[PDB]
């Protein structure tokens, strides 16, 4: 049957036709890839075919050539390059002649151009592509459709294909796009097509950026292109201009005044959404990159080196003309306020908030007259921004000089929490919530505490949108109280503080609000539960009965969870169940760490059974059980050496936890659990060591596991020997071979991800050696005869840190444990290691910089290393 009719059916409204066409096209592509693609290219190249069929053919080839998942795309690229050259060149002839034959504003074949070149460019089997496109744009006889179709394909080329493969051919492409970017072009669609393609190729235009004359030529276009009457060209040129600022800030100085800053202020005055948004977005990036450069400036200032890059303080010299317009457009809110869509009203706040952080203390006088004047406006519009802008400028200025403004406005804030305007009450909740986090002392004042605290309690009973914003205020208020409680009340744990009077009232209210049916709205339940976690975590000694009651209540909440595992009928129900189970287990961690040892005995059996059944309740959904076993560890951390009552009923679950090999997080937590087990059970873990150790060594051999879990797996080997003592000799030979092999692996220094990955890897290697040395050392007596088993390896272990000392990447964590290990090695042998260390002077310079290291534990291990080194030298 004719394939032209097939292209029509894939767009016709019929379900049976869609699957039949998809099956036939997929089968034919696999059956005969070269011939069928040639047939497809022949049909689309014909201008006489219907445009609908040509669009369908374009997307079908686009779907076959490219996809969303990179791995699927990558293997398709390999499949395409295996096709013979004549068939590959045959479609190239039709594709390069198909453009300009379609009246559609977008070009169907442009997507096809991108897909084929995804594999052609890396293999360089189509070298005449780029020169061909340049001639098409430069040709004055070209039609409008052919001009834009080529530009549309160009944008796709630089957006899908990897930037490295297009580094060399940047000069020719930029010459073509500028030719079609001239303001003399009559058609507006050519301008926007050139603008879209230009922004997609800014990542490899640096070869053209170095030429100042060319750089002035390129910016000469966009400055003139911004003044285009078409609104789409206005935003697109600005959007391209935004990305130009983001990359080449080091050289935009000479034109910001005469050319750039004039447009941005004008573009920000637009009554249209996008035009003002992009202008707001533009100056937000200026402050953003200013901050990162300020970070670089701060980094270079402390080191004493000159800053490799230097800013010019654009934000400070523009806020005079930025604040009044930004504040004016901050009042463009609507009655039907929604958080789903990004709008210039909310865009105004974030840019204003970013500006305050960037300019620090030079925004206070420019905003205070506006807020102080419109805070009494009869209409909620001006009162909304009078309080919203107050909170948006709270960060960046120093608290002491901002105290006089916040203290006098606080009596107004509580009254503003009562006006019938819904948005103002929602807005006020954030401001009081923000003021608690950033200003602890001001948020707690007895002249205003009692009215403020009462308003907060009444507030959460209102609509969820204001209940969510006030919950975080409650949690921060407790933390602010705690920061003020440890100073006044006791030194290690508070006994009774200010919030304790209303503590028992508010905690049960938080229990009440978690029961509200609208807990899903504005993540109310997760907001309250997290607030509940913090308020229980931060309590006073007189609140023990209060935390005792909710501990029983949350146990009853666990009982509710027990008998609802059969209520799953929808996926979203399980998702909330997954969220609910994680919150309660997380809440268990807070309460179990804030209870009495005696009180833990009664709850031990019920929780252990509950945790056991909840582990097996979730046969699937591995995410929730990640929180389960770490919650189990928290019980062990507090229960003590009385957890042996459940060890025999925990080994199959502990064993199967390490038997996953699929998710790295569970086994990453599992190796913590066994580390937590041996750290508390002490010498009673001997009968359980054989089962885990055999399985644990299997994880080392398999390399299909994630790279991140490997250092943690090696981390647990050292500590288990510290508990048992000198009973680990039956596995000592096996681990050293794996430790030998793991230490052999090395990688180059080109990508910072793997460069810092080996740092923590060798960090885990060091601490593993410390544990076995300390484990065989015993408790207080001299070196056991078991030390001779690792005696031949001490040269290799010192050799491994010899390479680390010779490296220059380094990490404060790495240099710490190495110093500690040296003391352990000095205790192990002493005089024997004296000859070994003298042959390696790089460890001497590695320990001297330990004094330089600012971390205190580095200092303690540094002095530990050098004190024993002197004793070895003074031994004889």
């Amino acid at each position: 049957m004719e394939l032209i009719t097939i292209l029509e059916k894939t767009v016709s409204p019929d379900r049976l036709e869609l699957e039949a066409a998809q099956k036939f096209l997929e089968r034919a592509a696999v059956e005969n890839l070269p011939t069928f693609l040639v047939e497809l290219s022949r049909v689309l190249a014909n201008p006489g075919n219907s445009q609908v069929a040509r669009v369908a053919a374009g997307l079908q080839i686009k779907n076959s050539l490219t996809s969303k998942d990179p791995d699927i795309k990558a293997q398709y690229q390999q499949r395409w390059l295996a096709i013979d050259a004549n068939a590959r060149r045959e479609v190239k002839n039709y594709v390069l002649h198909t453009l300009g034959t379609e009246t559609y504003r977008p070009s169907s074949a442009s997507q096809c151009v991108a897909g084929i070149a995804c594999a052609e460019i890396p293999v360089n089997q189509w070298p005449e592509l780029i020169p061909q496109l340049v001639a098409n744009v430069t040709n004055p006889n070209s039609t409008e459709h052919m001009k834009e179709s080529t530009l549309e394909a160009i944008g796709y080329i630089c957006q899908d294909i990897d930037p490295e493969q297009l580094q060399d051919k940047s000069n020719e492409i930029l010459t073509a796009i500028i030719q079609g970017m001239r303001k003399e072009e009559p058609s507006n669609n050519v301008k926007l097509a050139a603008t879209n393609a230009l922004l997609n190729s800014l990542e490899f235009t640096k070869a053209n950026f170095d030429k100042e004359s060319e750089r002035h030529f390129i910016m000469q276009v966009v400055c003139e292109a911004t003044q285009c009457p078409d609104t789409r060209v206005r935003v697109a040129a600005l959007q391209n201009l935004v990305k130009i600022m983001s990359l080449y800030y080091q050289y935009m100085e000479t034109y910001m005044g005469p050319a750039l800053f004039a447009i941005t202020i004008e573009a920000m005055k637009s009554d249209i959404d996008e035009v003002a948004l992009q202008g707001i977005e533009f100056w937000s990036n200026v402050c953003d990159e200013e901050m990162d450069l300020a970070i670089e400036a701060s980094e270079a200032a402390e080191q004493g080196r000159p800053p490799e890059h230097t800013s010019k303080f654009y934000a400070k010299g523009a806020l005079q003309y930025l604040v009044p317009i930004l504040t004016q457009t901050l009042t463009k809110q609507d009655e039907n306020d929604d958080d789903d869509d990004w709008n210039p009203c909310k865009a105004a706040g974030v840019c204003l908030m970013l500006l305050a952080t960037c300019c620090e203390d030079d925004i206070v006088p420019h905003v205070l007259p506006f807020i102080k004047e419109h805070i009494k406006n009869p209409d909620w519009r001006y009162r909304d921004a009078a309080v919203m802008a107050f909170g948006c400028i709270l960060e960046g200025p120093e608290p002491s000089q901002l105290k006089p403004l916040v203290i006098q406005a606080m009596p107004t804030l509580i009254e503003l929490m009562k006006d019938p305007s819904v948005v103002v009450r929602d807005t006020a909740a954030w401001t009081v919530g923000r003021i608690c986090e950033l200003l602890p002392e001001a948020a707690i004042n007895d002249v205003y505490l009692a009215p403020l605290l009462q308003c907060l309690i009444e507030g959460l009973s209102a609509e969820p949108r204001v209940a969510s914003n006030v919950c975080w205020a409650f949690s921060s208020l407790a933390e602010a109280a705690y920061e003020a409680a440890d100073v006044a009340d006791d030194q290690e744990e508070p006994a009774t503080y200010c919030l304790s009077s209303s503590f028992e009232l508010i905690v049960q209210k938080l229990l009440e609000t978690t029961d509200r049916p609208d807990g899903h709205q504005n993540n109310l339940r997760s907001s309250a539960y997290e607030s509940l976690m913090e308020i229980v975590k931060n309590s006073a000694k007189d609140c023990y009965p209060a935390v005792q009651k909710t501990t029983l209540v949350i146990m009853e909440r666990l009982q509710q969870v027990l008998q609802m595992e059969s209520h799953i009928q929808s996926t979203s129900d399980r998702i909330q169940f997954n969220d609910l189970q994680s919150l309660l287990c997380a809440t268990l961690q807070n309460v179990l760490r804030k209870v009495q040892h005696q009180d833990a005995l009664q709850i031990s059996d019920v929780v252990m059974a509950s945790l056991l059944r909840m582990f097996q309740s979730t046969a699937g959904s591995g995410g929730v059980q990640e929180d389960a076993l770490m919650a189990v560890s928290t019980l062990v951390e507090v229960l003590g050496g009385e957890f042996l009552k459940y060890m025999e009923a925990f080994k199959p679950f502990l064993g199967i936890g390490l038997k996953n090999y699929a998710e790295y997080q569970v086994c990453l937590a599992a190796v913590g659990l066994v580390g937590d087990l041996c750290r508390a059970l002490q010498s009673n873990i001997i009968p359980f060591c054989d089962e885990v150790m055999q399985l644990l060594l299997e994880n080392l051999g398999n390399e299909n596991v994630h790279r991140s879990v490997k250092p943690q797996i090696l981390s647990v080997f050292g500590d288990i020997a510290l508990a048992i003592g000198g009973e680990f000799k039956k596995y000592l030979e096996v681990v050293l071979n794996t430790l030998q092999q793991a230490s052999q692996a090395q990688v180059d220094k080109s990508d910072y991800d793997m460069v810092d990955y080996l740092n923590e890897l060798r960090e885990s290697c060091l601490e593993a050696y410390t544990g076995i040395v300390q484990g065989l050392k015993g408790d207080q007596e001299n070196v056991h005869p078991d030390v001779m088993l690792v005696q031949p390896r001490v040269e290799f272990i010192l050799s491994f840190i010899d390479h680390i000392a010779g490296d220059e990447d380094h990490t404060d964590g790495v240099v710490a444990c190495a110093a500690g290990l040296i003391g352990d090695l000095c205790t192990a042998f002493g005089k024997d290691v004296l000859k070994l260390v003298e042959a390696r002077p790089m460890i001497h310079e590695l320990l001297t910089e330990g004094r330089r290291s600012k971390t205190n534990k580095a200092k303690t291990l540094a002095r530990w290393a050098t004190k024993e080194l002197r004793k070895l030298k003074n031994q004889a």
Partner: protein
């Protein structure tokens, strides 16, 4: 794309809070490790 994670308190999701909690726990695990170790070594 969209930087909506800076509008008041809309950048506080269930997944976001998960990573904040675990990094605290591991530091406590780290802190408990050295504190137990340091007290046995020397003051």
């Amino acid at each position: 794309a969209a930087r909506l994670h800076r509008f008041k308190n809309k950048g506080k999701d269930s997944t976001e809070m998960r990573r904040r909690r675990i990094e605290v726990n591991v530091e406590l695990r780290k802190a408990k490790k050295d504190d137990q170790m340091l007290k046995r070594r020397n003051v």
